[PDB]
Each structure stands twice: as C-alpha cells, then as structure tokens.
Design a protein around this ligand. Structure first.
Ligand SMILES: Nc1nc2c(ncn2[C@H]2C[C@H](O)[C@@H](COP(=O)(O)OP(=O)(O)OP(=O)(O)O)O2)c(=O)[nH]1
Ligand SMILES: [Mg+2]
Length: 641
DNA sequence: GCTCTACGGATGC
DNA sequence: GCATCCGTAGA
C-alpha cells in the first residue's frame, strides 16, 4: 500500500536517497502545500495567495515508494542550506544527464519552485496533464482524479476520501480536505509517476511522444516562463483610455436620449428593439421579436444614425467592462522591474492546439479603433497600455498570413505557392478585386474584411453569410465562392481530402501529429456534420499554425538561452544587478510572438526571432514574418532589419 | 452552415 | 439559480 520515506530524518537515509536520485534518470517530483496554520519556519511562502505555504517535495521513481524531501525547518544535522543545495544539485541537468522529471501541472509547480523555493528546474518535463491533452485535445480539462481513473485504475483506492483532487488543481497544491501535505504530496507523486508511465506507453502507441517531448513540453516550459514574466501594463495609459472612452460613452448616451426623447437603456436588447423597430420606423431584418446583433445595426447604417450611435456605445462598453475592468482588476506589481505588470494564466488545453490566456484575456484586447469625439478621431488605443519594462521594447513577430502559407504547404496549390513565395499579399489582392480599386490603395479595415472573407471561403463559408458580410446578393456570393475555389484548385482538393480523411479515420492529424478526434464527422444531423467538416479543415491548419508557433517559441527560447547570458525570466531574476538583456517571451497571439526585448539587444534578438521563426519547420512555401518594434503594443512600427 | 478561445451580460426550465 | 446561451473581442 502506501509507503512514504522521510529522507530528511536520518543523515544516512538522506545520502542514500540522494544517491538513488542521482542514479535514476526519471523522477516524479511534486509540491506539498498546506495552510499557514498560524511563516519562515513551516516552509517557504508561495507567491500569490498568503493563506498557503509549501512544506516539501515528494519524489517517486517507481513503485509505491514516495520519498518525501522535507523542507521543514523543524534532524538538526540537515540544515536548510545543505538540504536546499542537495535539492538544487539533484534537480539541475548537466553533462548530458537525461532526466525526465514528471510533474502534474508543470507550469504552476515550476512557478512555485522558482518564486518561493528559488529552485531552477532544468531537466526534461513530462507533465501528465499535457500528455492527457495530447491524447484527447477536445476533451475536458484533466483533473487528477480523471487521469487516475482513466489511466491508472488500480491505484484509484489510494484516493479514497480525497475529494480535493477534483478542482482541476493538483491535490498537492491545494490545502483543503485536511490530508496534511506530506501524505497528499506523496500519494500525488505515486499517482502521477505510474499514470505518466502509462501515458508514455500510450504516446508510444499513438506515435505522439516525439511531439510531446520535443515541442509540446518545451512549449509548456516557454509558457511557464511567459507566466513568470507576464505581459506589461502602464496603468496611466489605461486610465486615460478609460476616461476618453467613458466621455465618448456619455456623449453618445446623451445624443441618443436627445434623439429618441426618453431614457431607453442600451444594455436592454428589448428596449433597443422597441425604440428602433416598433416605434421609430427602421424596418427590421430578414419581446425579442427582432434580432439586435451588431450586424443588424451595421446593416441599418444608411438610415438615420441612431444604430451607429448604439454600435459605438456597445463597442465602447465592451471595451470598458470586458477589457478595461478585468485588466485593472487582475493587475499585479513587480518591485524588481519598478513597473506594474500583469500576469495572465496560460492554457494549452484548447481544441485546435492554440494557447489562450485567462484571468484576464490579454489576447482579446481590441485593436486601435477611431472614435468620433467632437472638438480628428482620437484613435482610442488601449494596446498602448501594454508597455514593456523601462529600457525595453516590444518586439512582436507576426507571421505573414500564416494559415495561408500552411494551406499552400498542404495543398500543392501551384498558384497559391507562386503567389505566396513572391510576396503578393493575397488579402490585398482579394480586396482590390472585390472593391475594383488598385491593390496599393486599400485601407486597413478593408484589408481585414478581405482577410476574414478569404478565411471564411477557406473554412466553408455559406453563400448567405458571405453575401451578408460582403454586402452582395446570395447569387453573387455563390459565384464568388466558385471563383475562389476554381482559382485555387489545390485548396478545394485539400478540403475534400480533409473531409475524406476525417470521415475515414475519425480524427485529423496536425502537421506534427497532434491528432484531434472529431466523432461529429459521423453525425447524422446535416448541420453537425458540416460543422465537423469545417472544424476539421480549420484544425489541420490552425492547430498546425499554433504548433509551428510553439516550435518557433521553443527555438527562440533555446537561442536566447545560449545567447544573452542572464536570467531566463523575470521570475528567475526575482528568485535568484546589471541592465536587463534578454528576449522574455510575454504574450502569444496564436500567430504572433510578443517579446519584451531590451533596447541593447533589440536588433540582435529581433534577428534571432525572425530567423528562428522563418527557419522553423519548413514548408513548400517560405514562412515570412514581420518583426515589429514598439515602445508599446500600440505603436508597433515595422522593423525590416 | 467560417474555425479556436475567453468572458461578461441575458435569459432560463 | 447554477448553467448555459449569446454576443463581443482577439487571432
Ligand atoms: N477562421 C478564421 N481564422 C482566422 C481569421 N483571422 C485569422 N485567422 C487566423 C489566421 C492566422 O493563423 C492567424 C493570424 O491572424 P491575423 O489577424 O494576424 O492575420 P494574418 O497573420 O493571417 O495576416 P496579416 O498579419 O494581416 O499579414 O489567425 C478569421 O477571420 N477567420
Ligand atoms: Mg500574422
């Protein structure tokens, strides 16, 4: 049954444990976290919540043995200094010592080990959660109990009465359900080592271990570093943007109240519909009798401008309560950098394979949009609020149209490869063809509309929605659909091949092999089947783009680790002088790698990032990037050097 | 009958 | 009233 060995009680036992740890090439370390129970005696205070504390580690290199490395200050021969030195030495990789450390919730445990314990993990990582996601990307978030049930059933009764292993977070890190951190961490290590061995066998069966250990887990390490750095924030810039946005919101509200007389509430869809359709003419679209989406008011723009006022009000409100308040709320402070950063929580459990940041979402920050504030547009830019550290600069690296290049790779579209290799900007060409204007005289918003039209046609947009977005008839939209499909015959061939392969195999394989299972391809409902086909087409391209982005991130992290000898992260600086000099991955936009590169190495790291992103996994189409240097995320001036 | 994600407000059996 | 649904934003 349970077998926990206190390696911090006897000197000879400690030395034997250290020797066995050094001899072994695969660990299962885990973190024991309890309540304060009240500081500096019970253990290291974990950064963030002040009600939790770390007590020690639990290592299990096979079997039920759960050697517990106690970090408690209460064997006098083993002081904190020598114990921590041994822990760091055994957790440091050197002289080609292959060691696969297995850690549940690797990102959070890495952050805890660095920020509180001051221990820099440098070995390989084998997060069981990441392997579980790799097996079933579109499945729900893998709880500890879920992995134990689905991969290690025989060890299930060891979790008897352990209901704390249900809230996503590992039982080792939470402090509820009693179960003092010793037993919790030890049993957690026992569970995760064997479940990760089973996960490795399954990965070998599915031929997914190479991607798991070469790109997926190194990208998880890069995301951990991202979480320790965190995207920048300026506070004052966001305050100014909020003040201007609120002033414009008040002006719009007063103008609308003057126009319509009464004080109808914008937030109420029923009130808006009543004041628009059944009271002030404004014939409806094709209570809640009439739809009141953004598209409806956008269509009703040639009429009197109240729908435009409501659209501006809605956009400003969405920017002010969904993007401004969350940033001002979940905003931290970094005393070492002297500036107010904000650390998002990364999540790689997305369906296609992208990385999305929660609490808050830095990716869904609306870009620069002009506002009509009479006094010419103020061009409200709250991405301006994401300033880097003083003496640094954002070094964003956005791929030239990435799903297009990956499409041309996996289509054998001679036309598309020819167009993309010799830069022609397919989206600008589409805008020029649609609007009959010259390709050199197309605005940014027209370019974005053309890009969303092209991607829609790629991903099976219907004629009705195509005509609705493009402002043309159903027949004209269908004719445009056939014109686009015939122009790129390889794209259509790839679409049919994708649908056939997803129907035959039940899943779709990414460029490296991170298969996504789509049983809906066998659905009988026509809408569900069509959605499954479209999401399979989008998976093999979008997940491939995210996987290429992860490879580029891994390569850039490697190159900025060998070069620019310094701490690998701001959290590394906090745990363990001189000006800042490094890359410091801060944010990802599913095709764009924002880096908090210092001013001294702006050119060098810019060249390194561009080279490692272009020289990443190569296709029949050259992968182009547009490195943009900015004093913030707003003024990203082009950087072709 | 474009995809992926988050996320706050609106309904809701 | 948890529990989604829906509509907004980014890619
Ligand atoms: N289905 C769908 N996918 C999109 C859409 N926009 C972007 N994607 C994907 C394509 C790329 O993998 C990724 C990059 O989005 P961007 O806004 O940066 O456009 P893109 O990089 O393709 O071109 P650009 O940066 O303007 O030169 O997002 C869209 O409107 N629909
Ligand atoms: Mg791009």
């Amino acid at each position: 049954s349970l077998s926990i060995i206190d390696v911090a009680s006897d000197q000879n036992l400690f030395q034997t444990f250290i020797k066995e740890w050094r001899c072994k090439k695969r660990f299962s370390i885990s973190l024991a976290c309890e309540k304060i129970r009240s500081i500096r005696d019970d253990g290291f205070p974990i950064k963030g919540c002040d009600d939790t504390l770390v007590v020690g580690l639990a290592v299990c290199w096979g079997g039920r043995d759960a050697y517990y490395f106690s970090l408690q200050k209460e064997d006098p021969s083993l002081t904190l200094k020598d114990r921590m030195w041994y822990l760091q030495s055994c957790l440091r990789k050197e002289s080609d010592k292959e060691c696969s450390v297995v850690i549940y919730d690797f990102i959070q445990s890495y952050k805890i080990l660095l920020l509180s314990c001051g221990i820099s993990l440098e070995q390989s990582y084998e997060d069981p959660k990441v392997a579980c996601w790799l097996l079933d990307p579109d499945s729900q978030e893998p709880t500890l109990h879920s992995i134990v049930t689905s991969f290690l059933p025989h060890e299930l009764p060891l979790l008897e009465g352990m209901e704390t292993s249900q809230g996503i977070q590992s039982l080792g890190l939470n402090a509820g359900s009693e179960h003092s951190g010793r037993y919790r961490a030890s049993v957690e290590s026992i569970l995760i080592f064997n479940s990760m061995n089973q996960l490795n066998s399954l990965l070998q069966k599915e031929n997914l271990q190479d991607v798991f250990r070469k790109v997926e887990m190194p990208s998880q390490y890069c995301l951990a570093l991202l979480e320790l750095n965190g995207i920048g924030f300026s506070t004052a810039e966001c305050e100014s943007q909020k003040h201007i946005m609120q002033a414009k919101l008040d002006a719009i509200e007063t103008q609308a109240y003057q126009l319509a007389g009464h004080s109808f509430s914008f937030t109420s869809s029923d009130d808006i519909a009543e004041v628009l359709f059944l009271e002030l003419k404004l014939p409806p679209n094709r209570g809640r009798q009439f739809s009141t989406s953004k598209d409806v008011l956008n269509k009703l723009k040639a009429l009197h401008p109240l729908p435009g006022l409501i659209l501006e009000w809605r956009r400003i409100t969405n920017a002010i309560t969904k993007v401004v308040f969350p940033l001002q709320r979940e905003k931290c402070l970094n005393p070492f950098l002297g500036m107010e950063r904000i650390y998002p929580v990364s999540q790689s459990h997305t369906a296609t394979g992208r990385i999305t940041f929660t609490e808050p979402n830095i990716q869904n920050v609306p870009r620069d949009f002009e506002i009509k504030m009479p006094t010419m547009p103020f061009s409200i830019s709250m991405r301006h609020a994401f300033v880097p550290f003083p003496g640094g600069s954002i070094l964003a690296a956005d791929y030239s149209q990435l799903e297009l290049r990956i499409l041309a790779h996996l289509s054998h579209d001679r036309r598309l490869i020819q167009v993309l290799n010799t830069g022609a900007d397919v989206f600008r060409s589409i805008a020029a063809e649609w609007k009959m204007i010259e390709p050199e005289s197309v605005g940014d918003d027209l370019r974005q509309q053309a890009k969303q039209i092209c991607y829609g046609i790629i991903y099976g947009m219907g004629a009705k929605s195509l005509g609705e977005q493009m402002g043309i008839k159903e027949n004209d939209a269908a004719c445009y659909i056939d014109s686009f499909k015939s122009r790129y015959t390889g794209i259509n061939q790839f679409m049919t091949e994708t649908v056939k392969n997803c129907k035959r195999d039940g899943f779709v394989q990414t460029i490296l092999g991170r298969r996504r299972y789509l049983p809906g391809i066998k659905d009988n409902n026509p809408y569900r089947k069509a959605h499954a086909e479209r999401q399979a087409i989008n998976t093999i391209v979008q997940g491939s783009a995210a996987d290429i982005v992860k490879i580029a991130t891994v390569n850039i992290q490697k190159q900025l680790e060998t070069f620019h000898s310094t701490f690998k992260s701001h959290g590394h600086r906090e745990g363990m002088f001189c000006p800042i000099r490094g890359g410091f991955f801060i944010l990802q936009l599913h095709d764009e790698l924002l880096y908090e590169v210092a001013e001294e190495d702006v050119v060098q790291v810019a060249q390194i990032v561009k080279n490692e992103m272009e020289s990443a996994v190569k296709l029949s189409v050259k992968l182009k990037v547009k490195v943009k240097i900015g004093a913030s995320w707003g003024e990203l001036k082009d950087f072709d050097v």
